Protein backbone atom coordinates (compact mmCIF):
# COMPACT_ATOMS: atom_id res chain seq x y z
CA UNK A 1 0.00 0.00 0.00
CA UNK A 2 1.23 3.45 -1.03
CA UNK A 3 0.43 6.45 1.14
CA UNK A 4 -1.07 4.42 3.97
CA UNK A 5 -0.19 3.43 7.53
CA UNK A 6 0.12 0.49 9.89
CA UNK A 7 -3.12 -1.34 10.47
CA UNK A 8 -4.22 -2.15 14.00
CA UNK A 9 -4.32 -5.84 14.88
CA UNK A 10 -7.79 -7.22 14.21
CA UNK A 11 -8.73 -4.31 11.93
CA UNK A 12 -9.10 -6.70 8.97
CA UNK A 13 -9.81 -10.14 10.48
CA UNK A 14 -10.27 -11.68 7.01
CA UNK A 15 -6.95 -10.40 5.63
CA UNK A 16 -4.75 -13.32 4.61
CA UNK A 17 -1.16 -13.59 3.40
CA UNK A 18 -1.05 -15.88 0.37
CA UNK A 19 2.43 -17.41 0.18
CA UNK A 20 4.02 -19.36 -2.67
CA UNK A 21 6.60 -22.10 -2.22
CA UNK A 22 10.06 -21.51 -3.65
CA UNK A 23 13.39 -21.31 -1.85
CA UNK A 24 11.25 -20.98 1.25
CA UNK A 25 7.90 -19.28 1.60
CA UNK A 26 7.44 -15.80 0.19
CA UNK A 27 4.38 -13.58 0.39
CA UNK A 28 3.13 -13.29 -3.19
CA UNK A 29 -0.41 -11.93 -2.78
CA UNK A 30 -3.17 -11.06 -0.38
CA UNK A 31 -6.21 -13.26 0.15
CA UNK A 32 -9.64 -12.98 1.76
CA UNK A 33 -10.91 -15.50 4.31
CA UNK A 34 -14.51 -16.43 3.45
CA UNK A 35 -15.14 -19.44 5.71
CA UNK A 36 -13.35 -22.08 7.77
CA UNK A 37 -12.00 -23.86 4.68
CA UNK A 38 -12.51 -21.30 1.89
CA UNK A 39 -10.57 -18.22 0.79
CA UNK A 40 -10.72 -15.71 -2.07
CA UNK A 41 -7.93 -14.08 -4.07
CA UNK A 42 -7.02 -12.83 -7.53
CA UNK A 43 -6.78 -15.46 -10.25
CA UNK A 44 -3.47 -14.07 -11.51
CA UNK A 45 -1.97 -14.89 -8.09
CA UNK A 46 -2.49 -18.63 -8.66
CA UNK A 47 -2.73 -19.34 -12.41
CA UNK A 48 0.02 -21.70 -13.54
CA UNK A 49 1.38 -22.13 -10.00
CA UNK A 50 0.93 -24.47 -7.05
CA UNK A 51 2.22 -24.94 -3.52
CA UNK A 52 0.44 -22.30 -1.46
CA UNK A 53 -0.40 -21.54 2.15
CA UNK A 54 -2.38 -18.72 3.78
CA UNK A 55 -1.57 -16.96 7.05
CA UNK A 56 -4.48 -15.73 9.18
CA UNK A 57 -4.24 -13.17 11.96
CA UNK A 58 -0.75 -12.12 10.92
CA UNK A 59 0.57 -8.61 11.45
CA UNK A 60 4.36 -8.49 11.06
CA UNK A 61 5.36 -11.06 8.43
CA UNK A 62 9.03 -11.45 9.54
CA UNK A 63 7.85 -12.06 13.12
CA UNK A 64 6.03 -15.32 12.24
CA UNK A 65 3.14 -13.95 14.30
CA UNK A 66 0.27 -15.61 12.44
CA UNK A 67 -2.48 -16.86 14.73
CA UNK A 68 -3.59 -19.59 12.30
CA UNK A 69 -2.48 -20.97 8.95
CA UNK A 70 -3.43 -23.60 6.40
CA UNK A 71 -2.04 -25.24 3.30
CA UNK A 72 -4.09 -24.64 0.16
CA UNK A 73 -5.59 -27.94 -0.97
CA UNK A 74 -6.94 -26.70 -4.32
CA UNK A 75 -7.59 -23.53 -6.30
CA UNK A 76 -10.48 -22.75 -8.65
CA UNK A 77 -9.74 -19.85 -10.99
CA UNK A 78 -12.58 -18.20 -12.87
CA UNK A 79 -13.08 -20.19 -16.11
CA UNK A 80 -13.08 -16.97 -18.16
CA UNK A 81 -9.99 -15.50 -16.48
CA UNK A 82 -7.87 -13.86 -19.20
CA UNK A 83 -4.58 -12.88 -17.58
CA UNK A 84 -3.25 -11.01 -20.62
CA UNK A 85 -6.48 -9.61 -22.06
CA UNK A 86 -7.37 -5.91 -21.82
CA UNK A 87 -8.33 -5.11 -18.24
CA UNK A 88 -7.40 -8.63 -17.03
CA UNK A 89 -11.02 -9.86 -17.10
CA UNK A 90 -12.45 -12.11 -14.38
CA UNK A 91 -9.42 -11.96 -12.06
CA UNK A 92 -10.94 -13.92 -9.17
CA UNK A 93 -10.29 -17.37 -7.74
CA UNK A 94 -11.40 -19.43 -4.75
CA UNK A 95 -9.12 -21.63 -2.65
CA UNK A 96 -9.91 -24.72 -0.58
CA UNK A 97 -7.98 -24.77 2.70
CA UNK A 98 -6.58 -28.04 4.03
CA UNK A 99 -6.87 -26.86 7.65
CA UNK A 100 -9.95 -25.17 9.10
CA UNK A 101 -9.42 -21.52 10.09
CA UNK A 102 -11.62 -20.58 13.04
CA UNK A 103 -13.26 -17.23 13.73
CA UNK A 104 -11.34 -16.41 16.91
CA UNK A 105 -8.84 -13.89 18.18
CA UNK A 106 -7.95 -11.50 15.36
CA UNK A 107 -9.33 -13.85 12.67
CA UNK A 108 -12.82 -13.63 11.19
CA UNK A 109 -14.75 -14.25 8.00
CA UNK A 110 -15.41 -11.47 5.51
CA UNK A 111 -18.88 -10.27 4.60
CA UNK A 112 -19.10 -9.94 0.83
CA UNK A 113 -21.02 -7.40 -1.21
CA UNK A 114 -24.32 -8.81 -2.41
CA UNK A 115 -25.00 -9.53 -6.07
CA UNK A 116 -27.47 -6.62 -6.18
CA UNK A 117 -25.09 -4.15 -4.51
CA UNK A 118 -24.77 -0.60 -5.89
CA UNK A 119 -21.54 0.54 -7.54
CA UNK A 120 -20.47 2.56 -4.45
CA UNK A 121 -19.22 5.43 -6.64
CA UNK A 122 -17.99 8.24 -4.41
CA UNK A 123 -17.96 6.11 -1.25
CA UNK A 124 -15.00 5.80 1.08
CA UNK A 125 -13.17 2.47 1.14
CA UNK A 126 -10.03 0.89 2.56
CA UNK A 127 -7.26 -1.11 0.88
CA UNK A 128 -5.14 -3.46 2.99
CA UNK A 129 -2.22 -5.81 2.47
CA UNK A 130 1.53 -6.27 2.77
CA UNK A 131 2.35 -4.83 -0.66
CA UNK A 132 5.25 -2.50 -1.30
CA UNK A 133 5.08 0.93 0.33
CA UNK A 134 6.53 2.60 -2.78
CA UNK A 135 6.80 1.61 -6.42
CA UNK A 136 10.60 1.88 -6.37
CA UNK A 137 11.08 -0.28 -3.25
CA UNK A 138 12.79 -3.64 -3.66
CA UNK A 139 10.62 -5.53 -1.17
CA UNK A 140 7.18 -5.72 0.42
CA UNK A 141 5.97 -4.24 3.70
CA UNK A 142 6.77 -5.96 6.97
CA UNK A 143 3.71 -4.71 8.90
CA UNK A 144 0.17 -4.91 7.53
CA UNK A 145 -0.79 -1.61 5.91
CA UNK A 146 -4.08 0.05 5.07
CA UNK A 147 -5.23 3.30 3.50
CA UNK A 148 -8.51 5.17 3.09
CA UNK A 149 -9.49 6.11 -0.47
CA UNK A 150 -12.53 6.82 -2.65
CA UNK A 151 -14.42 4.50 -5.00
CA UNK A 152 -14.91 5.95 -8.49
CA UNK A 153 -17.35 5.21 -11.30
CA UNK A 154 -16.36 3.26 -14.40
CA UNK A 155 -16.01 6.35 -16.59
CA UNK A 156 -14.21 8.25 -13.82
CA UNK A 157 -11.74 5.36 -13.52
CA UNK A 158 -10.95 5.37 -17.24
CA UNK A 159 -10.64 9.16 -17.35
CA UNK A 160 -7.97 8.95 -14.62
CA UNK A 161 -6.15 6.18 -16.53
CA UNK A 162 -3.42 6.64 -19.14
CA UNK A 163 -5.11 7.21 -22.49
CA UNK A 164 -3.77 3.90 -23.84
CA UNK A 165 -5.01 1.92 -20.80
CA UNK A 166 -8.71 2.84 -20.60
CA UNK A 167 -9.70 -0.75 -19.89
CA UNK A 168 -11.71 -0.41 -16.67
CA UNK A 169 -15.03 -2.27 -16.91
CA UNK A 170 -18.20 -2.51 -14.84
CA UNK A 171 -16.87 -5.84 -13.54
CA UNK A 172 -14.08 -3.76 -11.95
CA UNK A 173 -14.25 -1.47 -8.94
CA UNK A 174 -11.52 1.17 -8.84
CA UNK A 175 -10.36 3.67 -6.23
CA UNK A 176 -8.32 6.84 -6.59
CA UNK A 177 -7.48 9.86 -4.46
CA UNK A 178 -7.72 13.31 -6.00
CA UNK A 179 -4.34 14.02 -4.38
CA UNK A 180 -2.93 11.02 -6.26
CA UNK A 181 -1.09 9.78 -3.17
CA UNK A 182 -2.79 6.48 -2.25
CA UNK A 183 -3.17 3.09 -3.87
CA UNK A 184 -2.21 -0.56 -3.95
CA UNK A 185 1.12 -2.02 -5.03
CA UNK A 186 2.76 -5.34 -5.88
CA UNK A 187 2.08 -7.76 -3.04
CA UNK A 188 -1.40 -6.34 -2.39
CA UNK A 189 -3.03 -8.23 -5.28
CA UNK A 190 -5.74 -10.66 -4.22
CA UNK A 191 -6.45 -8.70 -1.04
CA UNK A 192 -9.69 -7.02 -0.02
CA UNK A 193 -11.19 -3.63 -0.65
CA UNK A 194 -13.21 -2.91 2.49
CA UNK A 195 -16.21 -0.60 2.24
CA UNK A 196 -16.19 2.49 4.44
CA UNK A 197 -13.54 4.59 6.15
CA UNK A 198 -13.65 2.79 9.52
CA UNK A 199 -15.34 -0.06 11.33
CA UNK A 200 -16.75 -3.23 9.84
CA UNK A 201 -17.38 -3.05 6.10
CA UNK A 202 -18.23 -5.44 3.31
CA UNK A 203 -15.44 -6.70 1.09
CA UNK A 204 -16.38 -5.05 -2.22
CA UNK A 205 -13.25 -5.64 -4.31
CA UNK A 206 -10.31 -7.97 -4.90
CA UNK A 207 -7.00 -6.29 -5.77
CA UNK A 208 -6.24 -6.87 -9.46
CA UNK A 209 -4.00 -4.37 -11.28
CA UNK A 210 -2.59 -0.86 -11.40
CA UNK A 211 -0.26 1.41 -13.40
CA UNK A 212 3.52 1.65 -13.29
CA UNK A 213 6.38 3.36 -15.09
CA UNK A 214 10.10 2.59 -15.75
CA UNK A 215 11.07 3.54 -12.17
CA UNK A 216 7.99 2.70 -10.04
CA UNK A 217 6.03 -0.54 -10.39
CA UNK A 218 2.96 1.13 -8.88
CA UNK A 219 1.78 4.75 -9.10
CA UNK A 220 -0.85 6.40 -6.88
CA UNK A 221 -1.17 9.03 -9.63
CA UNK A 222 -3.44 6.51 -11.41
CA UNK A 223 -6.31 4.41 -10.02
CA UNK A 224 -5.97 0.99 -8.44
CA UNK A 225 -8.28 -1.54 -10.09
CA UNK A 226 -10.07 -4.29 -8.16
CA UNK A 227 -12.39 -7.06 -9.27
CA UNK A 228 -15.89 -6.01 -8.23
CA UNK A 229 -17.17 -8.50 -5.65
CA UNK A 230 -20.83 -7.75 -6.40
CA UNK A 231 -20.24 -8.67 -10.05
CA UNK A 232 -18.63 -11.99 -9.04
CA UNK A 233 -20.65 -12.73 -5.88
CA UNK A 234 -22.77 -15.53 -7.35
CA UNK A 235 -19.70 -17.17 -8.90
CA UNK A 236 -17.63 -16.94 -5.71
CA UNK A 237 -20.42 -18.47 -3.62
CA UNK A 238 -20.86 -21.30 -6.15
CA UNK A 239 -17.16 -22.15 -6.58
Numbering used by the authors: 1 to 239
The authors write:
Here, we introduce a small facultative plasminogen-independent thrombolytic enzyme, snFPITE, isolated from Sipunculus nudus. Compared to traditional thrombolytic agents, snFPITE does not require plasminogen for thrombolysis, although its presence enhances lytic activity. Native/SDS-PAGE, high-resolution mass spectrometry (HRMS), and ultrahigh-performance liquid chromatography (UHPLC) unveiled that snFPITE was a small monomer protein with a molecular weight of 24.925 kD. Mechanistically, snFPITE activates plasminogen and degrades fibrin(ogen) in a multisite cleavage manner. snFPITE is inhibited by plasminogen activator inhibitor 1 and α2-antiplasmin via a competitive inhibition.
Prior to crystallization, the protein samples were treated with the serine protease inhibitor phenylmethylsulphonylfluoride (PMSF). This treatment facilitated the clear observation of electron densities corresponding to the PMSF molecule covalently bonded to Ser189 of snFPITE-n1, snFPITE-n2-A, and snFPITE-n2-B within the PMSF-snFPITE-n1/n2 cocrystal structures. Based on protein sequence alignment, the closest homolog of snFPITE-n1 was found to be the fibrinolytic enzyme from Enchytraeus japonensis (44% identity). High-resolution crystal structures of both snFPITE-n1 and snFPITE-n2 reconfirmed that their catalytic triads consisted of His44, Asp91, and Ser189, and the weak substrate specificity might be caused by Gly183 and Ile88 residues in the binding pockets S1 and S2, or the four additional residues (Cys, Leu, Pro, and Asp) inserted into the S1 pocket of snFPITEs. Notably, both Asp91 and Ser189 established hydrogen bonds with His44, a feature that is essential for facilitating the catalytic interaction. Furthermore, the model of snFPITE-n1 complexed with a canonical human plasminogen peptide displayed that a steric clash between the peptide and snFPITE-n1 was absent, suggesting that this peptide could be an appropriate substrate for snFPITE-n1. This peptide was bound to snFPITE-n1 with the Arg580 residue inserted into the negatively charged pocket, as in tPA. Meanwhile, six snFPITE-n1 models with six 7-mer peptide substrates from α, β, and γ chains of fibrinogen revealed the absence of steric clash between snFPITE-n1 and these peptide substrates, suggesting that snFPITE-n1 could accommodate substrates from the fibrinogen chains. In all these models, the Lys or Arg residue was buried in the negatively charged pocket. Meanwhile, the pockets of snFPITE-n1, which were less charged than those of tPA and plasmin, were compatible with the broader substrate selectivity of this enzyme.
